[PDB]
C-alpha cells in the first residue's frame, strides 16, 4: 500500500523506484512480479507510467 | 527508508556548501577542481539517483569559487579580477 505510494514518487521525478520497470518507451509499465496480490494494482500503475514516460521525454 | 534519505539530504547540503561530507565522498578529476562526487549504494536506488542530478551543482560551484581564487592568487589587475568579485558576491 504505502510502499506503492512511495514507488510512484520516484518515477514521477524520473526513472524506476523500488523495482525495475525496463520500459522507457510507449509507457513505463510497472512490474511487481506478484500474482497472489489483487489485480487492481496493474491499472493504477498503468496510470503512473504515462506520467513517468511523459516526464523523461 | 526515509531517515536514510534524510541524512543523505543533509550530506548533500554540506556538499553544496563546498565541503566534504560523510557518506558522499569526493573524487579528484583534474585536482578536485571538477569534483565528480560519488555516493555509496543505497537500498533504494532511485533516491540515490535523485541526488545524482544534484552533484553537478556543487561540481560547478567548485569551479567558480576556485576561478575567483585563481585570478587573485596572481594579483591580476585586469577587468577579469573585477568580474570575479561579482562571482564572489553571487557566491
Swiss-Prot record, chain A:
Top-rank taxon, per record: Eukaryota
Localisation: Cytoplasm, Cytoskeleton, Microtubule organizing center, Centrosome
Quaternary state and interactors: Interacts with gamma-tubulin.
Family to which the UniProt record says this protein belongs: Belongs to the TUBGCP family.
Known role: Necessary for the recruitment of gamma-tubulin to the centrosome and for the formation of a functional centrosome.
Name of the featured protein: Gamma-tubulin complex component 3 homolog
